[PDB]
């Protein structure tokens, strides 16, 4: 959904992501350290999941300002 | 994320919390303001959810005295 936090907004537009099971953010003033767990099709390969995780990472780091750190883990839908 | 883990660790042991959907910590000096959305049984009532969420807010304020301020929201799991 695009009406929640900025990260979830970025991720709602990535077709192959079906959900975020867990979003953890740390804030020291404007600076953001993030850790996410996305849900992808459970019959995806592990390399397919990685690819999507990299896609999400890339999207987040260019679309969102003051990202110090972002890790994306993937998990079955 | 030191408090991240510490928070997750405490909530992990609270009966009827099925998961953490969202954790936000903000550093204000050397104290912490935290905001969590916890996962509870979808078939419980709202007042049972608020009961669980208050148990979490207390466990966290007590066990991590670095945390000045904590808000807990809840929402349904699967």
TrEMBL record, chain A:
Entry superkingdom: Bacteria
Signal peptide residues on this chain, from the entry's feature table: none
Location of this chain's protein in the cell: Membrane
Domain Cation efflux protein cytoplasmic: from-to ranges: 5-76
Family from the record: Belongs to the cation diffusion facilitator (CDF) transporter (TC 2.A.4) family.
Protein name: Magnetosome protein
Species this protein is from: Desulfamplus magnetovallimortis BW-1
């Amino acid at each position: 959904d695009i009406y929640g936090d900025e990260i979830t907004a970025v991720v709602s537009k990535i077709e192959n992501v079906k959900g975020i099971s867990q979003l953890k953010t740390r804030h020291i003033g404007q600076k953001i350290w993030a850790e996410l767990n996305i849900l992808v099709d459970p019959d995806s390969t592990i390399v397919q999941g990685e690819t999507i995780a990299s896609r999400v990472k890339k999207a987040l780091t260019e679309q969102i300002r003051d990202i110090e750190r972002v890790v994306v883990h993937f998990e079955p839908a």
